[PDB]
Amino acid sequence: IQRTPKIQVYSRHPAENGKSNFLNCYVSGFHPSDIEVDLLKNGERIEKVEHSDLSFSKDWSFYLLYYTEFTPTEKDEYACRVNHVTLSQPKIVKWD
Amino acid sequence: MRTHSLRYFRLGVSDPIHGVPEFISVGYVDSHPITTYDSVTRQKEPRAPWMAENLAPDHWERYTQLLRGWQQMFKVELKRLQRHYNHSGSHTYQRMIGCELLEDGSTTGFLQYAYDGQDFLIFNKDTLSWLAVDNVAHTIKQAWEANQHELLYQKNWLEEECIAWLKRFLEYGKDTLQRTEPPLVRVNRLFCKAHGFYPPEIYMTWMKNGEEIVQEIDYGDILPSGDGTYQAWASISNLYSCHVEHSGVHMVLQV
Ligand SMILES: *[C@@H](C)/C=N/c1c(NC[C@H](O)[C@H](O)[C@H](O)CO)[nH]c(=O)[nH]c1=O
Numbered sequence: 540i541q542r543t544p545k546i547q548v549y550s551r552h553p554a555e556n557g558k559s560n561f562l563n564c565y566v567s568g569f570h571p572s573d574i575e576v577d578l579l580k581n582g583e584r585i586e587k588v589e590h591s592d593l594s595f596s597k598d599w600s601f602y603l604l605y606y607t608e609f610t611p612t613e614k615d616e617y618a619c620r621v622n623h624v625t626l627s628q629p630k631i632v633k634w635d
Numbered sequence: 636m637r638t639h640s641l642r643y644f645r646l647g648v649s650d651p652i653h654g655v656p657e658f659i660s661v662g663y664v665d666s667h668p669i670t671t672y673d674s675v676t677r678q679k680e681p682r683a684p685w686m687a688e689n690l691a692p693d694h695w696e697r698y699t700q701l702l703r704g705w706q707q708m709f710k711v712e713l714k715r716l717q718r719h720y721n722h723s724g725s726h727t728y729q730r731m732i733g734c735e736l737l738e739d740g741s742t743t744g745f746l747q748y749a750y751d752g753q754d755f756l757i758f759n760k761d762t763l764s765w766l767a768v769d770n771v772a773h774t775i776k777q778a779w780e781a782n783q784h785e786l787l788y789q790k791n792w793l794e795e796e797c798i799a800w801l802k803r804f805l806e807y808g809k810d811t812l813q814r815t816e817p818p819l820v821r822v823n824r825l826f827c828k829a830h831g832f833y834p835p836e837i838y839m840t841w842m843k844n845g846e847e848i849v850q851e852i853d854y855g856d857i858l859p860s861g862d863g864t865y866q867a868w869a870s871i872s873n874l875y876s877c878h879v880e881h882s883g884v885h886m887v888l889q890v
Pocket residue numbers: 643644645660661662670671672679698702732789792
C-alpha cells in the first residue's frame with residue numbers, strides 16, 4: 540500500500556508581473572518517504588531551490604515544501620516536477 | 636488559549652537507499668517542527684529558535700543518548716515485524732506519541748504505531764490496552780500487554796508529562812504560537828482566496844442565498860506560504876457570498 544503525492548504549485552503572495560515573490564511547490568500525502576522534487580522555469584530545472592525537511596502527518600503520510608525566489612513575468616512559465624515510486628514517469632505540474 | 640498539541644514521530648526504514656537515514660524522529664508543537672534526530676547526525680537538534688534559546692546543552696545531550704537507544708529499539712522492532720509478515724525489501728515502521736491541551740482546559744493523549752504507513756497498534760490509555768489490526772499486531776499486543784507497568788508508565792507520560800512539556804514549550808514559543816495574523820480575503824472569477832493568516836486553522840465556505848450546500852463546494856488545502864503564514868481557497872440568478880472564520884472573527888464577502 541503506497542500513496543501518490545499531491546502536488547500544489549502557488550506563489551507566496553498574490554502574483555504581480557515584475558514584482559519579486561516566491562514560487563512554492565507543496566508535495567504531500569505520499570508514502571513511502573523517498574521523493575524527488577525539482578522546480579522548473581521554461582522547462583529547465585532551477586538551481587537555487589530551498590526546501591523544508593521531510594515532515595510527518597497523523598495519517599502516516601509525509602509532506603515537504605520546495606520554494607524559490609522569483610520575479611513572475613508574462614513570458615515565463617513555471618512548473619514543479621515530482622518523482623516517487625508510485626509514478627512511472629516524473630509528473631510535471633504547471634503553475635496557473 | 637487556543638487548542639495546542641505536542642507530537643513526536645519516529646520513522647524507521649529497513650534497507651534504505653544510499654544516503655536516506657534508517658531512522659528519523661521529529662517533534663512538533665502544533666504545525667511547528669521543534670526538534671530533530673536521525674541515524675546520520677546521531678544528534679537531537681532544535682528546529683525552532685525558541686527551543687534552542689530555552690533549553691540548555693544538557694537537555695540536548697541527554698535526549699541525544701535516549702534517541703540513540705530508541706533508534707536501536709526501532710531497528711529491532713521493525714526486524715521482528717518484517718520477519719513475522721515474511722516481507723522482503725524495504726518496509727517502514729512509524730510511531731506517533733502526543734497530547735493536546737484544549738481551549739476548555741481538557742486534555743487528550745494518544746500513542747500509535749504503523750507498518751508501511753498503515754495503522755498497526757493503537758494504545759488505549761483508559762483501558763490500558765493495545766488495539767491490534769491483524770495477527771502480527773496481535774502477537775506484539777500480547778507481549779506489550781504482559782508488561783503492565785509500561786502501560787501504566789505510558790498513561791502517566793501521556794496525561795502528565797506530555798502536558799507539562801507542551802505548557803513549557805508554549806511559553807518558549809509564545810510570540811510565534813499564540814499570535815494572530817488575520818487573513819486577507821478576495822473573491823475572483825467563483826473563487827474565494829485567503830492568505831497571510833496565522834494560525835493555519837480557518838474555515839472557508841460559499842453560501843448561495845444564505846444556505847451552504849457543502850456538496851456543490853470545492854475546498855483548497857491550507858498551504859504554507861513560506862513566511863510563517865498560510866493560504867487557502869474555496870471555489871463554487873442567485874446571491875453568492877464567501878464566509879471566512881478565523882480566530883473568533885467571522886468575515887463575509889458578498890458578490
Ligand atoms: C526531546 C525531548 C525529544 N524527545 C523525543 C521523544 N520524547 C517523548 C517521550 O519521552 C518518548 O516519546 C517516550 O517514548 C514516551 O514513552 N520522543 C520521540 O519519539 N522523539 C523525540 O525526539
